[PDB]
Design a protein around this motif. Sequence first.
Motif, PDB file in Angstrom:
ATOM      1  N   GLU A  63       0.709  -1.293   0.051  1.00  0.00           N
ATOM      2  CA  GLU A  63      -0.167  -0.038  -0.039  1.00  0.00           C
ATOM      3  C   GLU A  63       0.963   1.025  -0.075  1.00  0.00           C
ATOM      4  O   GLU A  63       1.848   1.361   0.749  1.00  0.00           O
ATOM      5  N   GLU A  64       0.448   2.274  -0.962  1.00  0.00           N
ATOM      6  CA  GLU A  64       1.007   3.469  -0.610  1.00  0.00           C
ATOM      7  C   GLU A  64      -0.091   4.635  -1.214  1.00  0.00           C
ATOM      8  O   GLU A  64      -0.432   4.672  -2.292  1.00  0.00           O
ATOM      9  N   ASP A  70      -1.488   7.870  -6.486  1.00  0.00           N
ATOM     10  CA  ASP A  70      -2.797   8.267  -6.672  1.00  0.00           C
ATOM     11  C   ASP A  70      -2.861   8.761  -8.319  1.00  0.00           C
ATOM     12  O   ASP A  70      -3.514   8.424  -9.092  1.00  0.00           O
ATOM     13  N   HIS A  96     -11.812  -3.244  -0.633  1.00  0.00           N
ATOM     14  CA  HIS A  96     -10.964  -2.091  -0.425  1.00  0.00           C
ATOM     15  C   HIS A  96     -10.429  -1.685  -1.874  1.00  0.00           C
ATOM     16  O   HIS A  96     -10.371  -0.450  -2.310  1.00  0.00           O
TER      17      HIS A  96
HETATM   18  C1  LIG Z   1      -6.488  -4.501   1.060  1.00  0.00           C
HETATM   19  C2  LIG Z   1      -5.626  -3.588   1.538  1.00  0.00           C
HETATM   20  C3  LIG Z   1      -5.685  -3.220   3.040  1.00  0.00           C
HETATM   21  N1  LIG Z   1      -5.176  -4.289   4.026  1.00  0.00           N
HETATM   22  C4  LIG Z   1      -5.698  -4.199   5.260  1.00  0.00           C
HETATM   23  C5  LIG Z   1      -3.945  -4.582   3.741  1.00  0.00           C
HETATM   24  C6  LIG Z   1      -3.583  -5.063   2.344  1.00  0.00           C
HETATM   25  N2  LIG Z   1      -4.039  -4.205   1.542  1.00  0.00           N
HETATM   26  C7  LIG Z   1      -3.434  -3.750   0.330  1.00  0.00           C
HETATM   27  C8  LIG Z   1      -2.322  -4.299   0.078  1.00  0.00           C
HETATM   28  C9  LIG Z   1      -1.393  -3.693  -0.974  1.00  0.00           C
HETATM   29  C10 LIG Z   1      -1.910  -2.914  -1.834  1.00  0.00           C
HETATM   30  C11 LIG Z   1      -3.388  -2.436  -1.542  1.00  0.00           C
HETATM   31  C12 LIG Z   1      -3.974  -1.386  -2.427  1.00  0.00           C
HETATM   32  N3  LIG Z   1      -4.990  -0.849  -2.081  1.00  0.00           N
HETATM   33  O1  LIG Z   1      -5.196  -0.007  -3.442  1.00  0.00           O
HETATM   34  C13 LIG Z   1      -4.362  -0.302  -4.139  1.00  0.00           C
HETATM   35  C14 LIG Z   1      -4.195   0.312  -5.569  1.00  0.00           C
HETATM   36  C15 LIG Z   1      -3.255  -0.083  -6.331  1.00  0.00           C
HETATM   37  C16 LIG Z   1      -5.624   0.036  -6.034  1.00  0.00           C
HETATM   38  C17 LIG Z   1      -5.966   1.105  -7.483  1.00  0.00           C
HETATM   39  C18 LIG Z   1      -6.190   2.542  -6.778  1.00  0.00           C
HETATM   40  C19 LIG Z   1      -5.113   2.789  -5.939  1.00  0.00           C
HETATM   41  S1  LIG Z   1      -4.685   4.493  -5.546  1.00  0.00           S
HETATM   42  C20 LIG Z   1      -3.472   4.069  -4.646  1.00  0.00           C
HETATM   43  N4  LIG Z   1      -2.663   5.046  -4.123  1.00  0.00           N
HETATM   44  C21 LIG Z   1      -3.402   2.747  -4.352  1.00  0.00           C
HETATM   45  C22 LIG Z   1      -2.412   1.955  -3.535  1.00  0.00           C
HETATM   46  N5  LIG Z   1      -1.123   1.587  -3.122  1.00  0.00           N
HETATM   47  C23 LIG Z   1      -4.385   1.987  -5.476  1.00  0.00           C
HETATM   48  N6  LIG Z   1      -3.699  -1.270  -3.445  1.00  0.00           N
HETATM   49  N7  LIG Z   1      -4.070  -2.749  -0.487  1.00  0.00           N
END
Ligand SMILES: C[C@H]1CN(C)CCN1c1cccc(-c2noc([C@@]3(C)CCCc4sc(N)c(C#N)c43)n2)n1
Length: 168
Positions: A63-64, A70, A96
């Motif tokens: 995650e970032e 964005d 999510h």
């Molecule tokens: C499900 C959650 C929360 N969980 C508690 C831990 C693991 N987790 C993760 C783990 C890894 C990644 C992510 C994730 N979320 O969004 C995104 C993306 C790429 C999607 C497209 C739109 C945007 S815009 C932005 N800035 C994003 C970023 N990064 C995203 N990637 N989420």
Amino acid sequence: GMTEYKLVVVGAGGVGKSALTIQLIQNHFVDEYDPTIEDSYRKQVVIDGETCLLDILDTAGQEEYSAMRDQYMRTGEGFLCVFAINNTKSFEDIHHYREQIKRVKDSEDVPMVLVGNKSDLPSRTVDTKQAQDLARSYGIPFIETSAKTRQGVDDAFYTLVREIRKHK
Ligand SMILES: C[C@H]1CN(C)CCN1c1cccc(-c2noc([C@@]3(C)CCCc4sc(N)c(C#N)c43)n2)n1
Ligand SMILES: Nc1nc2c(ncn2[C@@H]2O[C@H](COP(=O)(O)OP(=O)(O)O)[C@@H](O)[C@H]2O)c(=O)[nH]1
Ligand SMILES: [Mg+2]
């Protein structure tokens, strides 16, 4: 001119984002692709007789939520939200990814397809009906895929292109 479609593949690590992307790009199943590599891959394809240029961003990593990331995901015109049919947590993560797509695109109407991958495996933990009903809740299509056998791969990417054409 030839239309280019920016497609972004998202979902939990290990669901098969890279394997699906490489099946489309190489026409070959890759069971091992460095899970940290995030990159983009282009392919000319005929969808409904139209030659168009697909630009597929295979996402990876942690995650970032920076302005930079964005902005980067904002370039995507449509999104595949991928889970694996034998991993309940990857399915429970889908909301999510959808919520972040809606946020960064600032729209309730972003072309999107729900993808249930690893359909070739017998270890199912997510009922197809539950997955179809989630796509129904979002008003988007649901496609069952296997990157291993190529089941559904064109269906997933081509449907997303069709959703983009509609949205325009
Ligand atoms: C499900 C959650 C929360 N969980 C508690 C831990 C693991 N987790 C993760 C783990 C890894 C990644 C992510 C994730 N979320 O969004 C995104 C993306 C790429 C999607 C497209 C739109 C945007 S815009 C932005 N800035 C994003 C970023 N990064 C995203 N990637 N989420
Ligand atoms: N049986 C099966 N294994 C798959 C499929 N897609 C990916 N895999 C495996 O799932 C793991 C993660 O795949 P990968 O493409 O790296 O996932 P990513 O982290 O979402 O990019 C690897 O062990 C792949 O071999 C599929 O459709 N069927
Ligand atoms: Mg990967």
